[PDB]
Write a protein that binds this ligand. Structure first.
Ligand SMILES: CCCCCCCCCCCCC(=O)O
Ligand code: NA
Length: 118
């Protein structure tokens, strides 16, 4: 779920939401070019995770609601029986964690369509 994903990001980092809404070549809707740094690489993978998720019947990562738990900054996926809920939760979980780990370069904030993401 796009909103739950927001919270995993909230639950695992210091950096706010708009902080990722549009950063580098892949953080944000769709992606082009080659990832910029490793934070953008987090977004690249997330993306791909979402594409694979779509390979599950009736599975829309973007709107699927799963069961997860947060205890700043640890987050857990409680889905077992719903294959889509779990695949998507791990997708989002892995991203949040990936984000908290990566450095935040302020010069990559809006290089979109600017030519490096061909
Ligand atoms: C206010 C938040 C809603 C934004 C919806 C806009 C488009 C791209 C959104 C999220 C991408 C997060 C990460 O870079 O994968
Ligand atoms: Na993207």
């Amino acid at each position: 779920n796009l909103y739950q994903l927001m919270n995993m990001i909230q639950c695992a980092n210091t950096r706010t939401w708009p902080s990722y809404t549009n950063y580098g070549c892949y953080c944000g809707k769709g992606g082009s070019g080659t990832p910029v740094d490793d934070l953008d690489r987090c977004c690249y993978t997330h993306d791909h995770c979402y594409n694979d998720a779509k390979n599950i019947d009736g599975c829309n990562p973007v709107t699927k609601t799963y069961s997860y738990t947060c205890t700043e900054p640890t987050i857990t996926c409680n889905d077992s029986k719903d294959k889509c809920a779990r695949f998507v939760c791990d997708c989002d979980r892995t991203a949040a964690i990936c984000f908290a780990k990566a450095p935040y370069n302020t010069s990559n904030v809006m290089i979109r369509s600017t030519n490096s993401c061909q």
